[PDB]
Amino acid sequence: KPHNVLLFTLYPNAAIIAKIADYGIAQYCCRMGIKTSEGTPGFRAPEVARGNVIYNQQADVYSFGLLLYDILTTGGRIVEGLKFPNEFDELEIQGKLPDPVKEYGCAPWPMVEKLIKQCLKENPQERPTSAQV
Amino acid sequence: KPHNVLLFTLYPNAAIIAKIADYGIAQYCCRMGIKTSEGTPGFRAPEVARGNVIYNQQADVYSFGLLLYDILTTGGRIVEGLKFPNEFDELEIQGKLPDPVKEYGCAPWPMVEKLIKQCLKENPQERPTSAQV
């Protein structure tokens, strides 16, 4: 989520800025996948939302994509999700999300809107791996 | 003065933070000294204040000392100098200045209070050179 990302400095030309915390539901996914479905609604992969699949580490890429969608449009959809958590979760699980530039009115960043269109596909095999992102 | 010093970033672990500007009265002091007395009252050396001496580059060290006195006690005396510019100039020219820790109430910094006691002496020959500071 945009809440487990910790900022250590706001100076752009630093060496360490962002860090990751809150490893409460981190598990082991070697080759066989995972059956338990956990994660905050609205930041879950489509496979994580449903409880009838065995998903792999690549379901964590979708969440990153959502994070990059919130980083891009300054957390625009998180504010609106407070009013409608049901629509929040439904759209996050489904994948029918608005174009980030069109609605929230941000300066175009065409080389990360491509990532946001890549690592949000409903098919986990098509999303880039974490080493490719 | 603490007005010709320009800040380019407030991140301590940078490479360039402070810079010097406003070279309006910068002159040439090879070996023979200078006779003209110029500079903002309250930031001048004792020799600069009087107009009957031939001072050298080391009269610019005193000003630096005053700057380090304002950097230390967060520009304490500059605020009080607005109410009494005459006392401001008189004390700056004379040299009878209060102990920075005692009056303005700052955390002790004993290795820069030594500079403020060194490069504010009434005898220009005793102050450290700019390469020693």
Side-chain angles (χ1 to χ4, degrees), chain A residues 1-79 81 85 88 91 95 97-101 103-133, chain B residues 1-10 12-79 81 85 88 91 95 97-101 103-133:
Chain A
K1 304 177 283 186
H3 328 350
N4 298 5
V5 174
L6 300 170
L7 313 170
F8 277 61
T9 187
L10 302 166
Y11 178 60
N13 313 276
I16 288 178
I17 297 180
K19 281 193 191 225
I20 299 174
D22 190 31
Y23 306 101
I25 50 184
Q27 269 285 343
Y28 270 111
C29 200
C30 60
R31 294 169 319 207
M32 299 168 73
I34 299 169
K35 284 182 66 177
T36 50
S37 80
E38 302 211 28
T40 305
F43 308 96
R44 298 176 302 181
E47 49 262 15
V48 176
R50 70 197 72 186
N52 310 325
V53 290
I54 299 173
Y55 57 100
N56 50 23
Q57 310 186 89
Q58 210 159 6
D60 204 9
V61 181
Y62 187 97
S63 303
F64 180 82
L66 296 180
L67 175 70
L68 196 49
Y69 188 91
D70 294 330
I71 286 173
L72 181 66
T73 63
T74 65
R77 57 171 266 276
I78 307 175
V79 179
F88 205 49
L91 291 192
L97 282 179
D99 192 75
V101 179
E103 184 173 359
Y104 302 99
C106 55
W109 203 354
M111 280 275 268
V112 306
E113 296 154 42
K114 193 165 63 174
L115 294 174
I116 304 173
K117 286 182 75 68
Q118 283 186 243
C119 62
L120 273 72
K121 292 186 179 295
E122 198 270 331
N123 189 17
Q125 197 176 276
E126 308 186 30
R127 327 185 179 129
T129 54
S130 297
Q132 291 172 6
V133 178
Chain B
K1 304 177 283 186
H3 318 19
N4 298 5
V5 174
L6 300 170
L7 313 170
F8 277 61
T9 187
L10 303 166
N13 313 276
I16 288 178
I17 297 180
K19 281 193 191 224
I20 299 175
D22 190 31
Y23 306 101
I25 50 184
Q27 269 285 343
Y28 270 111
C29 200
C30 60
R31 294 169 318 207
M32 305 165 61
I34 299 169
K35 284 181 66 178
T36 50
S37 80
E38 302 211 28
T40 306
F43 308 96
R44 298 176 303 181
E47 50 262 15
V48 176
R50 71 193 72 186
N52 310 325
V53 290
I54 299 173
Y55 57 100
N56 50 23
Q57 310 186 89
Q58 210 159 6
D60 204 9
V61 181
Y62 187 97
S63 302
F64 180 82
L66 297 180
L67 175 70
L68 196 49
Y69 188 91
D70 294 330
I71 286 173
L72 181 66
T73 63
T74 65
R77 57 171 266 276
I78 307 174
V79 179
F88 205 49
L91 291 192
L97 282 179
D99 192 74
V101 179
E103 184 173 359
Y104 302 99
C106 55
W109 203 354
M111 271 206 88
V112 307
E113 297 155 42
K114 193 165 62 174
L115 294 174
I116 304 172
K117 286 183 74 68
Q118 284 186 243
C119 62
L120 273 72
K121 292 186 180 295
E122 199 270 331
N123 189 16
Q125 197 176 276
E126 308 186 30
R127 327 186 179 129
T129 54
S130 297
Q132 291 172 6
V133 178

CSV table of all heavy atoms in Angstrom, one decimal, chain A residues 75-110, unseen atoms left out:
chain,number,residue,atom,x,y,z
A,75,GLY,N,-2.0,10.0,-5.3
A,75,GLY,CA,-3.0,9.3,-4.4
A,75,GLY,C,-4.4,9.7,-4.7
A,75,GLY,O,-5.2,9.9,-3.7
A,76,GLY,N,-4.8,9.9,-6.0
A,76,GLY,CA,-6.1,10.4,-6.3
A,76,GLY,C,-7.2,9.5,-6.0
A,76,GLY,O,-8.2,9.9,-5.4
A,77,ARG,N,-7.1,8.2,-6.3
A,77,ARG,CA,-8.2,7.2,-6.1
A,77,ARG,C,-8.3,6.8,-4.7
A,77,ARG,O,-9.4,6.3,-4.3
A,77,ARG,CB,-7.9,6.0,-7.0
A,77,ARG,CG,-6.6,5.3,-6.8
A,77,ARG,CD,-6.6,4.0,-7.6
A,77,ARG,NE,-7.0,2.8,-6.8
A,77,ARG,CZ,-6.2,2.1,-6.0
A,77,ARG,NH1,-4.9,2.5,-5.8
A,77,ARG,NH2,-6.6,1.1,-5.3
A,78,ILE,N,-7.3,6.9,-3.9
A,78,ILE,CA,-7.4,6.5,-2.5
A,78,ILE,C,-8.3,7.5,-1.7
A,78,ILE,O,-9.1,7.1,-0.8
A,78,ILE,CB,-6.0,6.5,-1.8
A,78,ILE,CG1,-5.0,5.7,-2.6
A,78,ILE,CG2,-6.1,6.0,-0.4
A,78,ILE,CD1,-3.6,5.7,-2.1
A,79,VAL,N,-8.3,8.8,-2.1
A,79,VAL,CA,-9.2,9.7,-1.5
A,79,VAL,C,-10.7,9.4,-1.8
A,79,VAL,O,-11.5,9.4,-0.9
A,79,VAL,CB,-8.9,11.2,-1.9
A,79,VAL,CG1,-9.8,12.2,-1.3
A,79,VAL,CG2,-7.4,11.5,-1.6
A,80,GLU,N,-10.9,9.1,-3.1
A,80,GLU,CA,-12.3,8.7,-3.5
A,80,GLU,C,-12.7,7.4,-3.0
A,80,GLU,O,-13.9,7.1,-2.9
A,80,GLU,CB,-12.4,8.8,-5.0
A,81,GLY,N,-11.8,6.5,-2.7
A,81,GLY,CA,-12.2,5.2,-2.1
A,81,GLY,C,-12.7,5.2,-0.7
A,81,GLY,O,-13.4,4.2,-0.3
A,82,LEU,N,-12.4,6.3,0.0
A,82,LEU,CA,-13.0,6.4,1.3
A,82,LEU,C,-14.5,6.5,1.3
A,82,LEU,O,-15.2,6.0,2.1
A,82,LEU,CB,-12.4,7.6,2.1
A,83,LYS,N,-15.0,7.3,0.3
A,83,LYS,CA,-16.5,7.4,0.1
A,83,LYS,C,-17.1,6.2,-0.3
A,83,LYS,O,-18.3,5.8,0.1
A,83,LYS,CB,-16.8,8.6,-0.8
A,84,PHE,N,-16.5,5.4,-1.2
A,84,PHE,CA,-17.1,4.2,-1.8
A,84,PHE,C,-16.0,3.0,-1.7
A,84,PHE,O,-15.4,2.7,-2.7
A,84,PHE,CB,-17.5,4.4,-3.2
A,85,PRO,N,-15.8,2.5,-0.5
A,85,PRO,CA,-14.9,1.3,-0.4
A,85,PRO,C,-15.3,0.1,-1.3
A,85,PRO,O,-14.5,-0.6,-1.7
A,85,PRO,CB,-15.0,1.0,1.1
A,85,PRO,CG,-15.4,2.2,1.8
A,85,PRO,CD,-16.4,2.9,0.8
A,86,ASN,N,-16.6,-0.1,-1.4
A,86,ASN,CA,-17.1,-1.2,-2.3
A,86,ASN,C,-16.7,-1.0,-3.7
A,86,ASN,O,-16.2,-2.0,-4.3
A,86,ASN,CB,-18.6,-1.3,-2.2
A,87,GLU,N,-16.9,0.2,-4.3
A,87,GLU,CA,-16.5,0.4,-5.6
A,87,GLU,C,-14.9,0.4,-5.7
A,87,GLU,O,-14.4,-0.1,-6.7
A,87,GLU,CB,-17.0,1.8,-6.1
A,88,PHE,N,-14.2,0.9,-4.7
A,88,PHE,CA,-12.8,0.8,-4.6
A,88,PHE,C,-12.3,-0.7,-4.8
A,88,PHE,O,-11.5,-0.9,-5.7
A,88,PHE,CB,-12.3,1.3,-3.2
A,88,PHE,CG,-10.9,1.8,-3.2
A,88,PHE,CD1,-10.5,2.7,-4.2
A,88,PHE,CD2,-10.1,1.4,-2.2
A,88,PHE,CE1,-9.2,3.2,-4.2
A,88,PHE,CE2,-8.8,1.9,-2.2
A,88,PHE,CZ,-8.3,2.8,-3.1
A,89,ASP,N,-12.8,-1.6,-4.0
A,89,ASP,CA,-12.4,-3.0,-4.0
A,89,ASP,C,-12.8,-3.6,-5.4
A,89,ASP,O,-12.1,-4.4,-5.9
A,89,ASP,CB,-13.0,-3.7,-2.9
A,90,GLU,N,-14.1,-3.3,-5.8
A,90,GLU,CA,-14.6,-3.9,-7.0
A,90,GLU,C,-13.7,-3.5,-8.2
A,90,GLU,O,-13.4,-4.4,-9.1
A,90,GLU,CB,-16.0,-3.5,-7.3
A,91,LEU,N,-13.4,-2.2,-8.4
A,91,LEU,CA,-12.6,-1.8,-9.5
A,91,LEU,C,-11.1,-2.3,-9.4
A,91,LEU,O,-10.5,-2.6,-10.4
A,91,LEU,CB,-12.6,-0.3,-9.6
A,91,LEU,CG,-13.9,0.4,-10.0
A,91,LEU,CD1,-13.7,1.9,-10.3
A,91,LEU,CD2,-14.6,-0.4,-11.1
A,92,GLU,N,-10.6,-2.3,-8.2
A,92,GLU,CA,-9.2,-2.8,-8.0
A,92,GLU,C,-9.1,-4.3,-8.4
A,92,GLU,O,-8.2,-4.7,-9.0
A,92,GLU,CB,-8.8,-2.6,-6.5
A,93,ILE,N,-10.1,-5.1,-8.0
A,93,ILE,CA,-10.1,-6.5,-8.3
A,93,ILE,C,-10.4,-6.7,-9.8
A,93,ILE,O,-9.7,-7.5,-10.4
A,93,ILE,CB,-11.2,-7.3,-7.4
A,94,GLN,N,-11.4,-6.0,-10.3
A,94,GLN,CA,-11.7,-6.2,-11.7
A,94,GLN,C,-10.6,-5.8,-12.7
A,94,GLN,O,-10.0,-6.6,-13.4
A,94,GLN,CB,-13.0,-5.4,-12.1
A,95,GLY,N,-10.2,-4.5,-12.6
A,95,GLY,CA,-9.2,-3.9,-13.4
A,95,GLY,C,-9.6,-2.8,-14.3
A,95,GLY,O,-8.8,-2.1,-15.0
A,96,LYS,N,-10.9,-2.5,-14.3
A,96,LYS,CA,-11.5,-1.4,-15.1
A,96,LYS,C,-11.2,-0.1,-14.4
A,96,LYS,O,-12.0,0.5,-13.6
A,96,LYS,CB,-13.0,-1.6,-15.3
A,97,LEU,N,-10.0,0.5,-14.6
A,97,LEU,CA,-9.5,1.7,-14.0
A,97,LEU,C,-9.4,2.8,-15.0
A,97,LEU,O,-9.1,2.6,-16.1
A,97,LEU,CB,-8.2,1.5,-13.3
A,97,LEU,CG,-8.2,0.8,-11.9
A,97,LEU,CD1,-6.8,0.6,-11.4
A,97,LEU,CD2,-9.1,1.5,-10.9
A,98,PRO,N,-9.7,4.0,-14.6
A,98,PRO,CA,-9.7,5.2,-15.5
A,98,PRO,C,-8.2,5.5,-15.9
A,98,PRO,O,-7.3,5.1,-15.2
A,98,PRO,CB,-10.3,6.3,-14.7
A,98,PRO,CG,-11.1,5.7,-13.6
A,98,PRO,CD,-10.3,4.4,-13.3
A,99,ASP,N,-8.1,6.1,-17.0
A,99,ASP,CA,-6.8,6.6,-17.5
A,99,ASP,C,-6.2,7.6,-16.5
A,99,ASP,O,-6.9,8.6,-16.2
A,99,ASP,CB,-6.9,7.2,-18.9
A,99,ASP,CG,-5.5,7.4,-19.5
A,99,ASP,OD1,-4.8,6.4,-19.9
A,99,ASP,OD2,-5.0,8.6,-19.6
A,100,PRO,N,-5.0,7.4,-16.0
A,100,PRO,CA,-4.5,8.3,-14.9
A,100,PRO,C,-4.5,9.8,-15.3
A,100,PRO,O,-4.8,10.7,-14.5
A,100,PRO,CB,-3.2,7.8,-14.6
A,100,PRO,CG,-2.8,6.9,-15.7
A,100,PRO,CD,-4.1,6.3,-16.2
A,101,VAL,N,-4.1,10.1,-16.5
A,101,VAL,CA,-3.9,11.5,-17.0
A,101,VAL,C,-5.3,12.1,-17.1
A,101,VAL,O,-5.5,13.3,-16.8
A,101,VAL,CB,-3.1,11.6,-18.2
A,101,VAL,CG1,-3.0,13.0,-18.7
A,101,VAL,CG2,-1.7,11.0,-18.0
A,102,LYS,N,-6.3,11.4,-17.7
A,102,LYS,CA,-7.5,12.0,-18.2
A,102,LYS,C,-8.3,12.5,-17.0
A,102,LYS,O,-8.8,13.7,-17.0
A,102,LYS,CB,-8.3,10.9,-18.9
A,103,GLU,N,-8.6,11.7,-15.9
A,103,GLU,CA,-9.5,12.1,-14.9
A,103,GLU,C,-8.8,13.0,-13.8
A,103,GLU,O,-9.3,14.1,-13.5
A,103,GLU,CB,-10.1,10.9,-14.3
A,103,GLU,CG,-11.2,11.2,-13.2
A,103,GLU,CD,-11.9,10.0,-12.7
A,103,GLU,OE1,-11.6,8.9,-13.2
A,103,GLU,OE2,-12.8,10.2,-11.8
A,104,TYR,N,-7.7,12.5,-13.2
A,104,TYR,CA,-7.1,13.2,-12.1
A,104,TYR,C,-6.3,14.4,-12.5
A,104,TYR,O,-5.8,15.1,-11.6
A,104,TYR,CB,-6.2,12.2,-11.3
A,104,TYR,CG,-7.0,11.0,-10.8
A,104,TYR,CD1,-7.0,9.8,-11.5
A,104,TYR,CD2,-7.8,11.0,-9.7
A,104,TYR,CE1,-7.7,8.7,-11.1
A,104,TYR,CE2,-8.5,9.9,-9.3
A,104,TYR,CZ,-8.5,8.8,-10.0
A,104,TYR,OH,-9.2,7.7,-9.5
A,105,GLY,N,-6.1,14.6,-13.8
A,105,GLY,CA,-5.4,15.8,-14.3
A,105,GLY,C,-4.0,16.0,-13.8
A,105,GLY,O,-3.7,16.9,-13.1
A,106,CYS,N,-3.1,15.1,-14.3
A,106,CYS,CA,-1.7,15.2,-14.0
A,106,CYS,C,-0.9,15.3,-15.3
A,106,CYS,O,-1.4,15.1,-16.4
A,106,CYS,CB,-1.2,13.9,-13.3
A,106,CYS,SG,-1.6,12.4,-14.1
A,107,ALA,N,0.3,15.8,-15.2
A,107,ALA,CA,1.2,15.9,-16.4
A,107,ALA,C,1.5,14.6,-17.0
A,107,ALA,O,1.8,13.6,-16.2
A,107,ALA,CB,2.5,16.7,-16.0
A,108,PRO,N,1.4,14.4,-18.3
A,108,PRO,CA,1.6,13.1,-18.9
A,108,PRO,C,3.0,12.5,-18.6
A,108,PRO,O,4.0,13.2,-18.7
A,108,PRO,CB,1.4,13.3,-20.4
A,108,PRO,CG,0.7,14.6,-20.5
A,108,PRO,CD,1.1,15.4,-19.3
A,109,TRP,N,3.0,11.2,-18.3
A,109,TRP,CA,4.3,10.5,-18.1
A,109,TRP,C,4.2,9.2,-18.9
A,109,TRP,O,3.9,8.1,-18.3
A,109,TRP,CB,4.5,10.2,-16.6
A,109,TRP,CG,6.0,10.0,-16.3
A,109,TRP,CD1,7.0,9.9,-17.2
A,109,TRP,CD2,6.5,9.9,-15.0
A,109,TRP,NE1,8.2,9.7,-16.5
A,109,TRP,CE2,7.9,9.7,-15.1
A,109,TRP,CE3,6.0,9.9,-13.7
A,109,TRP,CZ2,8.8,9.5,-14.0
A,109,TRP,CZ3,6.8,9.7,-12.6
A,109,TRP,CH2,8.2,9.5,-12.8
A,110,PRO,N,4.3,9.3,-20.2
A,110,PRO,CA,4.0,8.1,-21.1
A,110,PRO,C,4.8,6.9,-20.8
A,110,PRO,O,4.4,5.8,-21.2
A,110,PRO,CB,4.2,8.6,-22.5
A,110,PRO,CG,5.1,9.8,-22.3
A,110,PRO,CD,4.8,10.4,-21.0
